[PDB]
Design a protein around this nucleic acid. Structure first.
Ligand SMILES: [Zn+2]
Lengths: 180, 205
RNA sequence: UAAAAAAA
RNA sequence: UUUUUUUU
């Protein structure tokens, strides 16, 4: 339940951004895929009032009602990479549920460019959750899946194709050099 | 197949058409990703610069459909030889459109449109783009009950029947349905310079 | 005052 | 979302 404009307003993030200065917020998009009966659920979480979308989505999965029998391959396409503390909350919530396997794909490597958020997401890609930045498909996946692809179109048909490619080309090599 | 059909490929298209006796030609170049189901195309009118709606030409641009790995991609395997396809579109007000096309990328199209009413939504340009239409596939045949949006409300319906035949025999797949969405990304006032975007993905029936 | 690119 | 460097 997103807007086509909001997609590029929050997911598209270049090295030097657009004409308005830093009008950017954090979003998360959880795609829970129960493969038992092929019963998928989807949802977006804005960075709410002093509770990062990771914690909000954790509490959503908590208070929604889980099924301890089967395993879930949950993908999560988020705009801005999670910070240090919520990443550790995420890995502690994932260690308590062995029936969960999570993939994290971010659009931009959001952090305070200090030390804590460097290894805060290095434990994920090395212990439980393969964390890589978005490329072409995961954007194209999150584009029509989460953001409503209904009748109207807010003049963003393929403008992302070049911006998604720039973001991939730069930040994916950045994240690979970080993981290495 | 994957070694010759790279994840990014361009094409050139030449179309000769005649609508209600008005002859024209269109030259275009495009680019996209065949395995991800996205493509964009830029067209230019070279003759007759069009007295009719451009939307009747958009559904004619199919080798860029995303197929799962466990589903044989019938259209991709036809290359490098290519394929052909012939389409008949009968509009509800008597308009008829017959299209033939060869794909080898090099596309050669021959189009003939006849019996369009002078006060109909096609010749009067009262259309607002095509609605989403799920085409069920089962040579390969495809039938569409397509709906064209009207400016004043309602829909403008048409029956489309297309036959796709590959130049080389390959394994035919089972029953499936393809979700397709086409968008006009940019156009001038007289629709002489048009860019189009297409997304297509197959699903089990 | 615009914009291309790279490092932590 | 904060720094450092090169070029037009
Ligand atoms: Zn956080």
């Amino acid at each position: 339940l997103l807007t086509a404009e909001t997609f590029r307003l929050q997911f598209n993030n270049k090295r030097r951004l657009r004409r308005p200065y830093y009008p950017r917020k954090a979003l998360l998009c959880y795609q829970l895929t129960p493969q038992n009966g092929s019963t998928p659920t989807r949802g977006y979480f804005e960075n709410k009032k002093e509770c990062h979308a990771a914690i909000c989505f954790i509490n959503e999965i908590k208070s929604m009602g889980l099924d301890e029998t089967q395993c879930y391959q949950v993908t999560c396409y988020l705009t801005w990479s999670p910070c240090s503390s919520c990443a550790w909350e995420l890995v502690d919530f994932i260690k308590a549920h062995d029936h969960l396997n999570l993939r994290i794909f971010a659009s931009r490597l959001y952090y305070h460019w200090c030390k804590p958020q460097q290894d805060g997401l290095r434990l994920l890609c090395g212990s439980q959750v393969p964390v890589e930045v978005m490329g072409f498909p995961e954007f194209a996946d999150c584009w029509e899946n989460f953001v409503d692809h209904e009748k109207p179109l807010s003049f963003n048909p393929y403008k992302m194709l070049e911006e998604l490619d720039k973001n991939s080309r730069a930040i994916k090599r950045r994240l690979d050099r970080i993981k290495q | 197949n994957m070694a010759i059909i790279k994840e990014f490929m361009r094409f050139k298209v030449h179309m000769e058409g005649s609508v209600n006796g008005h002859e024209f030609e269109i030259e275009g170049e495009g680019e996209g990703r065949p395995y991800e189901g996205t493509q964009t195309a830029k067209l230019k009118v070279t003759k007759g610069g069009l007295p009719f709606a451009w939307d009747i030409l958009s559904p004619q641009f199919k080798a860029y459909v995303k197929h799962p790995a466990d589903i044989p991609d019938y259209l991709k395997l036809s290359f490098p030889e290519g394929f052909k396809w012939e389409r008949v579109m009968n509009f509800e007000d008597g308009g008829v459109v017959t299209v033939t096309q060869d794909s080898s990328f090099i596309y050669k199209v021959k189009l003939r449109g006849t019996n369009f009413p002078s006060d109909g939504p096609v010749m009067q340009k009262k259309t607002m783009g095509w609605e989403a239409s799920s085409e069920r596939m089962y040579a390969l045949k495809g039938e569409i009950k397509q709906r064209l949006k009207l400016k004043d409300g309602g829909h403008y319906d048409a029956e489309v029947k297309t036959t796709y035949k590959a130049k080389k025999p390959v394994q035919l797949p089972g029953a499936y349905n393809v979700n397709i969405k086409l968008d006009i990304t940019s156009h001038n006032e007289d629709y002489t310079i048009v860019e189009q975007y297409e997304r297509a993905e197959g699903r089990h029936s």
